[PDB]
Amino acid sequence: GTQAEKTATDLPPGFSGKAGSANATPGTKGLDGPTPLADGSFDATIFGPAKELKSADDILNVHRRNAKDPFAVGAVDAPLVITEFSDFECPFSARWSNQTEPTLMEEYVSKGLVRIEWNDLPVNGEHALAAAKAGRAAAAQGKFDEFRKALFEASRNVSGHPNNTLKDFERFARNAGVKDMERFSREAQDSTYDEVLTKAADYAHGLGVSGTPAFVVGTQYISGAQPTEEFIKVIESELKKSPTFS
C-alpha cells in the first residue's frame, strides 16, 4: 500500500494557510459597487448598524449589508463583513488603508469572501470632521473608495496628522474622479452632512468605540492597525466559524 497517494492531511491552523477561505461560500451579489438612487447619485447619509445592538449577542448587527451603501466594497452576500471605524487624520487609520486593505482586497474582497464597510469615527477634531464631511461628499457621487485612497496615500509618510483642509480635499476629489466639483465643494463645507456625522459619532460611542481604527471582523473586535497577518488569521478563523451567508 506504499505505492499510493492520499489527500493532504489536515494540519493545525498555524500550518494550514487558507482553510477558512477554502471551505467558505463566496457571495455573488453587489460585487459591482453600490446601488445608486433614482438620479444616479448615492445615499451618502448611510451610517449605523443593520439593527439596534442590545447585548454582545447582537454583534453581527454592526454589519449593514445595505446594497445602497456607498461606504462599502465587496459582495452584499459575502460570508464575512469587516466593519471599520476610522478617522481621516489618524496615521493608524492611514496605515491600515495603505498597507493592509490592499492585501484584503486582493485575497478576499475581489473573491466575494469579504465585504468592508466604513464607519466615521472622527476623534482628531476639526480637520477629521471636515475630512469626514468631504468623504461623504465624495460618496454622494460614487467615489468614496477612490477619495479614501487618494487622501490616505497622501498621508503615507506622515507620522502624525496631515492637517488637511478644503483645498486638499478638493485635490483628492479631483484625483478620485468626482465629476461634479461644484456639488463636492459645496457639500464638503455646508451643513449637508453635519447631522449624520453627529449620529455616526454617537452610534460609535454607544458601542464604546473610542479609538481609531477599530474593527468588527465577523464576530471579533480588533482595536488598532494590527499587523496584516493578524487580520488574515482572524478572517480565516471567522470564515471557519461561519462559512456561508444566507
Which residues would be at the binding site for Cl ion (CB under 5 A)? 49, 52-53
Q: How far is the CB of 198 from Cl ion (least distance, A)?
A: 15
Question: Quick one: the chain helix, strand, coil %, rounded to 5?
Answer: 45, 10, 45
Task: Give the sheet arrangement for strand 114-120, strand by strand.
Answer: 72-73, 114-120, 80-86, 214-217, 220-223
- Smaller CB separation from Cl ion, 49 or 70: 49
- Smaller CB separation from Cl ion, 53 or 105: 53
Q: What spatial distance separates the first Cα and last Cα of the chain, rounded to whole Å? A: 43
- Smaller CB separation from Cl ion, 183 or 199: 199
Q: How far is the CB of 61 from Cl ion (least distance, A)?
A: 7
Is-cis flag, bond preceding 227, omega within 30? no
- Smaller CB separation from Cl ion, 49 or 135: 49
Residue whose CB is nearest to Cl ion in the complex, by number = 53
Amino acid code (one letter) for 99: Q
Q: How far is the CB of 60 from Cl ion (least distance, A)?
A: 12
In whole angstroms, what is the distance from residue 125 CA to residue 73 CA?
A: 27
In whole angstroms, what is the distance from residue 73 CA to residue 82 CA?
A: 10
Q: How far is the CB of 34 from Cl ion (least distance, A)?
A: 22
In whole angstroms, what is the distance from residue 67 CA to residue 87 CA?
A: 23
Nearest by Cα to 133 from 169, 80, 163: 169
DSSP per residue over 124-167, as a string? S-HHHHHHHHHHHHHHHTT-HHHHHHHHHHHTTT-SS-----HH
- Smaller CB separation from Cl ion, 52 or 106: 52
- Smaller CB separation from Cl ion, 62 or 137: 62
Q: How far is the CB of 206 from Cl ion (least distance, A)?
A: 6
Q: Which residue has the cell 462559512?
A: 243
- Smaller CB separation from Cl ion, 100 or 119: 119
In whole angstroms, what is the distance from residue 108 CA to residue 236 CA?
A: 10
Q: How far is the CB of 207 from Cl ion (least distance, A)?
A: 7
In whole angstroms, what is the distance from residue 174 CA to residue 147 CA?
A: 9
Q: How far is the CB of 53 from Cl ion (least distance, A)?
A: 4
